[PDB]
Amino acid sequence: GTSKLKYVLQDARFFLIKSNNHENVSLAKAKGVWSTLPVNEKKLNLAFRSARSVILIFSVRESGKFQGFARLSSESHHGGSPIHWVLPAGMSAKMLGGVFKIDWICRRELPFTKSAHLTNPWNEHKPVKIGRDGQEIELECGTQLCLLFPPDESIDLYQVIHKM
Numbered sequence: 324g325t326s327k328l329k330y331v332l333q334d335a336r337f338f339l340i341k342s343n344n345h346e347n348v349s350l351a352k353a354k355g356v357w358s359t360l361p362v363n364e365k366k367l368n369l370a371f372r373s374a375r376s377v378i379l380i381f382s383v384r385e386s387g388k389f390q391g392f393a394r395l396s397s398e399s400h401h402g403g404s405p406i407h408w409v410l411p412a413g414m415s416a417k418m419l420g421g422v423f424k425i426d427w428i429c430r431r432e433l434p435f436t437k438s439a440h441l442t443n444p445w446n447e448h449k450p451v452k453i454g455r456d457g458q459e460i461e462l463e464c465g466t467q468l469c470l471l472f473p474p475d476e477s478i479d480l481y482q483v484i485h486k487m
């Protein structure tokens with residue numbers, strides 16, 4: 324069913340995450356973590372205090388798809404176990420901020436062809452697939468986008484609901 328999912332998304336905030344490569348999304352799915360640039364880290368930390376749920380919707384650049392979505396379970400923190408993120412070219416991971424803990428809500432993919440009817444008011448009503456890393460997605464568009472994903476029957480949202 325979709326009822327617990329709708330409860331988790333009620334009055335949520337949504338952010339588009341653009342990963343440079345599939346390796347980083349695979350690490351995030353395995354370890355329940357994400358890290359971003361300080362400009363976006365500050366936005367996500369503000370949002371985490373401001374909303375019942377903050378949802379990250381992931382898309383690997385040039386893949387033509389979203390790879391799933393997850394809910395922040397913490398503000399960013401430093402000093403944890405290192406994560407061997409992959410960065411394009413020889414760019415240094417030192418530019419990243421802290422680490423957010425996340426709980427995956429859906430690990431299934433969704434092709435951009437299926438979200439063509441959704442526009443994001445916070446990005447000039449462009450199709451929701453279009454946006455820089457960290458672009459906020461307005462509530463209604465973000466909710467409908469998450470509801471388009473195939474159900475992920477491996478996930479039990481009972482534990483997530485307890486964290487709200």
Ligand SMILES: CNC(=O)c1n[nH]c2ccc(I)cc12
Nearest residue numbers: 347358359360408410411414
């Ligand atoms: C695991 N997160 C990243 O690798 C990442 N997040 N935002 C970015 C902006 C520029 C570059 I180069 C890399 C990133």
